[PDB]
Amino acid sequence: RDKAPVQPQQSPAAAPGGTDEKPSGKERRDAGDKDKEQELSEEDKQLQDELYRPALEELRRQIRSSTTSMTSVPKPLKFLRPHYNKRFAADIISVLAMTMSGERECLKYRLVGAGEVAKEWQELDDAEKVQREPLLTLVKEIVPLLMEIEQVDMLEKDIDENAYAKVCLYLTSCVNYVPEPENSALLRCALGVFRKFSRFPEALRLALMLNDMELVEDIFTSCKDVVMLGRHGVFLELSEDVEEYEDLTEIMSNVQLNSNFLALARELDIMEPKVPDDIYKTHLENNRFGGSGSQVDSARMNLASSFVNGFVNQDKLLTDDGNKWLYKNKDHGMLSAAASLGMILLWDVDGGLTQIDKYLYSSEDYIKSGALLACGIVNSGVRNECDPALALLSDYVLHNSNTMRLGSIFGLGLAYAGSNREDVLTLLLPVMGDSKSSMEVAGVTALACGMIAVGSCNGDVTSTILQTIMEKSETELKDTYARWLPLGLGLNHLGKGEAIEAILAALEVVSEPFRSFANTLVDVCAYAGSGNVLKVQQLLHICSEHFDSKEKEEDKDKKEKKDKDKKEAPADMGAHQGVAVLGIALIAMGEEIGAEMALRTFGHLLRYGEPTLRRAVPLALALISVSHDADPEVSYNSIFAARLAAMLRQLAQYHAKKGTLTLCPYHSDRQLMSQVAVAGLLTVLVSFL
Amino acid sequence: KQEEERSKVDDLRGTPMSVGTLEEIIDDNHAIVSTSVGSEHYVSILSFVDKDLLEPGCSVLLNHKVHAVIGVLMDDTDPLVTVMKVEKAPQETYADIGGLDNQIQEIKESVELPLTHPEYYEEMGIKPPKGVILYGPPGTGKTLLAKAVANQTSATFLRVVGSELIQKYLGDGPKLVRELFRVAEEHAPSIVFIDEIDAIGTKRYDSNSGGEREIQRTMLELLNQLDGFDSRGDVKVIMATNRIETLDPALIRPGRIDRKIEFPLPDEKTKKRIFQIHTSRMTLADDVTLDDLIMAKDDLSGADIKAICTEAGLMALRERRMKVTNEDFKKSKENVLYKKQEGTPEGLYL
Amino acid sequence: LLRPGRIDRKIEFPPPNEEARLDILKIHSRKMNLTRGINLRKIAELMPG
Amino acid sequence: LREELQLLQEQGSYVGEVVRAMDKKKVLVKVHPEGKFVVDVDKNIDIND
Numbered sequence A: 001r002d003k004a005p006v007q008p009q010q011s012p013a014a015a016p017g018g019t020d021e022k023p024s025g026k027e028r029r030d031a032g033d034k035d036k037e038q039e040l041s042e043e044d045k046q047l048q049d050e051l052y053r054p055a056l057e058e059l060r061r062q063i064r065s066s067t068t069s070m071t072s073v074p075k076p077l078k079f080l081r082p083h084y085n086k087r088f089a090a091d092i093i094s095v096l097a098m099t100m101s102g103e104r105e106c107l108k109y110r111l112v113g114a115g116e117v118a119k120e121w122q123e124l125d126d127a128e129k130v131q132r133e134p135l136l137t138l139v140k141e142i143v144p145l146l147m148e149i150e151q152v153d154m155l156e157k158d159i160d161e162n163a164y165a166k167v168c169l170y171l172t173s174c175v176n177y178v179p180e181p182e183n184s185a186l187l188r189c190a191l192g193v194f195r196k197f198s199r200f201p202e203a204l205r206l207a208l209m210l211n212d213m214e215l216v217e218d219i220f221t222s223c224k225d226v227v228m229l230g231r232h233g234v235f236l237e238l239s240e241d242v243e244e245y246e247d248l249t250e251i252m253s254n255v256q257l258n259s260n261f262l263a264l265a266r267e268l269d270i271m272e273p274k275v276p277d278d279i280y281k282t283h284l285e286n287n288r289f290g291g292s293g294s295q296v297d298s299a300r301m302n303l304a305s306s307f308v309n310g311f312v313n314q315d316k317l318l319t320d321d322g323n324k325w326l327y328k329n330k331d332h333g334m335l336s337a338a339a340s341l342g343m344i345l346l347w348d349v350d351g352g353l354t355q356i357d358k359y360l361y362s363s364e365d366y367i368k369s370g371a372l373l374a375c376g377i378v379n380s381g382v383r384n385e386c387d388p389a390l391a392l393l394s395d396y397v398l399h400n401s402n403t404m405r406l407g408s409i410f411g412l413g414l415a416y417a418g419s420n421r422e423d424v425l426t427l428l429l430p431v432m433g434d435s436k437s438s439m440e441v442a443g444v445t446a447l448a449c450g451m452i453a454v455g456s457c458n459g460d461v462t463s464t465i466l467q468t469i470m471e472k473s474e475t476e477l478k479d480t481y482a483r484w485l486p487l488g489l490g491l492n493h494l495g496k497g498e499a500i501e502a503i504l505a506a507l508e509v510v511s512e513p514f515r516s517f518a519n520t521l522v523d524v525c526a527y528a529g530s531g532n533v534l535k536v537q538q539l540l541h542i543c544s545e546h547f548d549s550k551e552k553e554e555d556k557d558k559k560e561k562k563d564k565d566k567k568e569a570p571a572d573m574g575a576h577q578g579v580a581v582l583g584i585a586l587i588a589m590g591e592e593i594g595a596e597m598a599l600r601t602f603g604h605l606l607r608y609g610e611p612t613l614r615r616a617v618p619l620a621l622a623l624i625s626v627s628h629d630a631d632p633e634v635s636y637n638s639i640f641a642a643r644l645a646a647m648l649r650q651l652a653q654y655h656a657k658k659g660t661l662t663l664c665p666y667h668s669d670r671q672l673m674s675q676v677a678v679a680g681l682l683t684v685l686v687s688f689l
Numbered sequence B: 001k002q003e004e005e006r007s008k009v010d011d012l013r014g015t016p017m018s019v020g021t022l023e024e025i026i027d028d029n030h031a032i033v034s035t036s037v038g039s040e041h042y043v044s045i046l047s048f049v050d051k052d053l054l055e056p057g058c059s060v061l062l063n064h065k066v067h068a069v070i071g072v073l074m075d076d077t078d079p080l081v082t083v084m085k086v087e088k089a090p091q092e093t094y095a096d097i098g099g100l101d102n103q104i105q106e107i108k109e110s111v112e113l114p115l116t117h118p119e120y121y122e123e124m125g126i127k128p129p130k131g132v133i134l135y136g137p138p139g140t141g142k143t144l145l146a147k148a149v150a151n152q153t154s155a156t157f158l159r160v161v162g163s164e165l166i167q168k169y170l171g172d173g174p175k176l177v178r179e180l181f182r183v184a185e186e187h188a189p190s191i192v193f194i195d196e197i198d199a200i201g202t203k204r205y206d207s208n209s210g211g212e213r214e215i216q217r218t219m220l221e222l223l224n225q226l227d228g229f230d231s232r233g234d235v236k237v238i239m240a241t242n243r244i245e246t247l248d249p250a251l252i253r254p255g256r257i258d259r260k261i262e263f264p265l266p267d268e269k270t271k272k273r274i275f276q277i278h279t280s281r282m283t284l285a286d287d288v289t290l291d292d293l294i295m296a297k298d299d300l301s302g303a304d305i306k307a308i309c310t311e312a313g314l315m316a317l318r319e320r321r322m323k324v325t326n327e328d329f330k331k332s333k334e335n336v337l338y339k340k341q342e343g344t345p346e347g348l349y350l
Numbered sequence C: 001l002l003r004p005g006r007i008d009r010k011i012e013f014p015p016p017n018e019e020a021r022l023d024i025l026k027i028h029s030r031k032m033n034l035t036r037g038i039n040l041r042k043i044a045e046l047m048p049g
Numbered sequence D: 001l002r003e004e005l006q007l008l009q010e011q012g013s014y015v016g017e018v019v020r021a022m023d024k025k026k027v028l029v030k031v032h033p034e035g036k037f038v039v040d041v042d043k044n045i046d047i048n049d
C-alpha cells in the first residue's frame, strides 16, 4: 500500500510503537517491503537506540542485509542469537543467511584464527538440512574437522547425492582447485560415511589417494561380507600401488579368513580370467605376423619387427617360430629377442620356465641375460627365478652376470616391491659398488630400487638412495648416469604428500647443471599435482632457462600435473622454438582415449624433419590409439618413403596393436637419442594389461 | 652475414612492390607478368625465393617500375575469409535434448560417424554422403543444428550464407567460388555449411549486371566446382533451405546431393523437454500444467515454445511476480499466437 | 520473416475509440482560438474511427 | 601562421585500404579502386599498430 500510514512509524523512539511495528514489519517481511527498502536513510539514525532490541537487530540485519554490507550485516545476528519451508524462511534463512552467513564464515575465516560462527554455522547446516538443497550450500560450507562433523552431521538418509554429487564435485575441485591439506579431511571422513555405505570401490578410490593399510583390511572383511569377486581382485591389483600388496600379503598372511584373498591380492589371479578369455573372445589374424612382419630386413627393423610381433599378445606363435630369427640379431637386440618371449608371456608361470629354459645358460651372454630378463617379465609372484641369476650377479667389473644384473635386478623390480624390500638392495650395494662403465647397471639399479621405492611413506632420504647420491657425485662421467640416477632418486621421492626432500637434496646435491638437473628431476617427481599454481608460474619462469635439458623434464612435468583438468593441457609449446619443447608437449599428449585436438596437434607434429623429434612423434601418436589407426601409419610411410625413419615406423606399428606402474618406463624412455644399448632398455616398457 | 645478404635481397626489392598474376613459365628465369590490367614486360625473377613453388599462372610479388618478379604470394583474403573460416567452435552442441531426436541420429551417423570413423567403409565399400539438404519450416532447428555440428565438430568448420556470392563485377562470384573451395580444400577435412540458397532462384538484385545471365554463371561455377571434378575425397558439404521450388534439379540429382532431410514440427513427447528446459531457468509456480500448452497448439515451432516461455515471465514479471500463474500462460499463448482461424469469417470446421 | 522468433512483438493498430478520439480531439483542439460552449463527445461520436 | 600554408602544397596522403599485414615489416595494401600492393612501412607506426 501507500507508505503514508506506515513510514512515520520509525520517527518516534517510543518502545511500544517499535514492539508492535517490528512484528508488523515481520509480517510484511514476507516480501521484504513494498520496494527496495527506501526506509534505509531514515532508520540508520535509529542505530544508536537500544526492551525488544533483538527484534530491532532483526530489523537492522534485515535492511543492512537488504542493501549491502560485508561485516556489519551479520553483526546483529551474532548479537540476536537467532530467535522468534516458508517463503519467509526462503528469505531470511536461505538466501539472506546464505550470503550473510557465508560472508561471516569467509570474513571470520580469513580475519580471526570463535564459537559463534560454529553455532550459527551448524545452524545453517541444519537449516540447509531442512531446505535439502546440496551442491551449493556444501561448497559454501567447505571453507567453514568442521567439514568432518558436517559430513557425519548430514549423511543419514541421502547417500548418492552427497557421495556422487559432493564427492564428485568436491573431489574433482579438491584435486583441481583446493590445496592438499583439507583433502585429507576429504580422504578420512569420506572413509567414515562410506564405512556406513555399500558400493565398496569408492573406498578403494579412497585407497587410490590415502595409501592406507587399514582400509584394505576393512574393505576385505567388508568385501568378504559382501560376496564380481575376482573382478574386485582385478581392479584391486590395478588400483593398488607397489607397497600395499606386500603389506597386504603379510597382514593377510596372518589371518587370511578364507586364504583366497592371498591367492587374489598378490598376483596369479588377476591374469587367470584374462589370458584364456583373451584367447577365447578375441581372434587375431596371421596377417599381422606376416603383413606388418613383411617390412624389409635390415637386421634393425627385423629386430623391431620381431618386437612388434612380440606384442601380438591365436596363440603364442612367435615363441616357437623356429630358429635364425635371433641368429641374425645383435647384442642388445639379443636382449630384445631373448626377452621377447616373456613379452608374449605375461602369464604361464610353469610354461615360462619350459620356454625360457632352452635359452637359459646358453652359449651367448645376451641370450641368457635377456632370458633372465624375460623371467623378470613373465610374472610377479614366483620368487623362484631369483636364484639362477641372483647368485651369479657379483662380477666386480664387466662380466656376463652384470648384464644379467641388467636383466634380473630390474626384472625382480618387475617382480616384487615390498614396503622396503632389502635383501635385493643389499645385493644392490655391490651393484652400485661395482659401478660398471655400462650405463644400465646403475640405470636398473636406480630404476629397480625405485620400483621397490615408489609409493613410499612420503619417500625417504635413506642411505640407499643417499648412497647413490654420494656415489653418484663420486664420478662425473657419462652424463646418462647424471640423468638416469635422478630417475630412480625421483622414484624414491614418489609416495610423497609433503616432501621437503626437494629441499634436502637441494642442500646436498646442487651444483653445475648435472646435479641442478638432478634438482629439476626431484622438482618434477616430488610435485605430482594439485591446485598448486605458484610452482606452475615458476614453471613459466624457469622455462626460459639457458640450459635446455632441465627444460625437458621440468616442462615434461605437465602431463603429470594437469592430467585431470586437461583443457589447459593444450598450450603453446608447439608455438615455442626450443625444439625439444615440441618434444615436451609431444610427450604431454600421452596414451589415453586420444581426442581430436590431440591428433590435430599430431598433424603438425607428425611433420617435422629431425629424426629425434620425428622419432618422438609416432610413439605417443600410436600409443594414444591402442583408415583411422593405420591412416597415420601410411602417412609416415609417405613421410620417409633414414633407418631412424623405419625404426619410428616400427615404433608406430608397435604402439598401434594415478597407477605408478604405467608412470615410470616412458620417463625412463626420455633419453632415446643414443645407442641401441639404450634401445635394449626400450623393451622394458610394460604398462599394458 | 645472412643479415647482409638478406638486406641485399631486400635492396633488390624496390619498396613499392606490386601483386600480379603469372601467365606462363618462361623457363630461363626471365618471365612475363600480367597485372590486373596486364602490362607484361620480359621481366626476370629474384633468384633466391623458390620459383618452383608455383604452378604457371599463379600470383607473385612484382615491382612497379621494372615489374621484375620479386617474391611469392601468400593467400587471398576477402571480407568472406573472415566469415567462411569459422574461427572458434562457437557454442551450443545442444542445450536441450528433446528437440528433434530423429534426424539428430541421422545427421550423427550420416555426417559425424563416416567423418570421425572412416573405417566402416573399408568393411563395406560405401562412399560417403557428399551433399545433404536440411529443409522445412522456418526456425525449426536447422540453423541451430548447423551451430550444433559447428560446436560439436571434428573438422575445420565453414559457415557460408548463400547470398554472400552476389556482386556487380563480372566473374567476381565464380572467383569467390574458387577462393571458396580453395578454403574448403586447404585446411583439413572441413565441414562446409551453406544456408539460404532457396533465395538464389527467383532473385534479381541492384548491384548487378544482366540478372538471368549473372548468377546462372556463378551457380554454374558452383555446379562445376562443388560436385563435378576436383576429387571430393573427404570434404563435407551441407546446405540448407526452407523451400524447394526454386531449386534447379541439376544439383538436386544424385552424385551431387545425396540426402534430402525434411523437418517436422515436434510432437508432444519432445515438446515437454523444450517447454521444460526453456522453463528450467525461471521461477515458476509449478502447480500449473504445461500439458495444456503442450497439447493445445498443434503446429508450434520451438520459437513458439521460447516465446510463450518468455512471455509468461513477461506477464508475471510484468507485475513483479517471480512465479507465474496459469492465466499468464493464457495471455502468453494468446499473445504469441495471433489470428487463430476458428470462427468469425467462415469457421466451416465446426 | 513472419516466424515469431524473428519478430517477437506483433501489434495491430485499430481505429481509436471515442474515448481516444475524444482525447486527441482535446489535443489538437487545445491550441486553437476556442469558443466556449462546445461538446466534443458529439464530434468524436460522429467519427467512424 | 600564414607561412605554414606551404604544408598545404603536399597534396595529402590518400587513404589506403589494408586487409592485413604480413611479416618482414611489410603490409598488404589494396589501393581504393586498384589491386594489391605490398609495401614497406614508416617508422612512427608499428606492425603491431
Ligand SMILES: Nc1ncnc2c1ncn2[C@@H]1O[C@H](COP(=O)(O)OP(=O)(O)OP(=O)(O)O)[C@@H](O)[C@H]1O
Pocket (backbone or CB within 6 Å): B096, B097, B098, B099, B100, B137, B138, B139, B140, B141, B142, B143, B144, B145, B241, B242, B266, B270, B273, B274, B301, B302, B303, B304, C003, C005, C006
Ligand atoms: N529442443 C527443441 N525441440 C524442437 N525444436 C526446437 C528445440 N529448440 C529449438 N527449436 C526450434 O528450432 C529453431 C532453432 O533456430 P533456427 O535456426 O531454426 O531459427 P531460424 O534462424 O529462423 O531458422 P531458419 O533461418 O532456417 O528459419 C527455433 O526456431 C525453435 O523453434
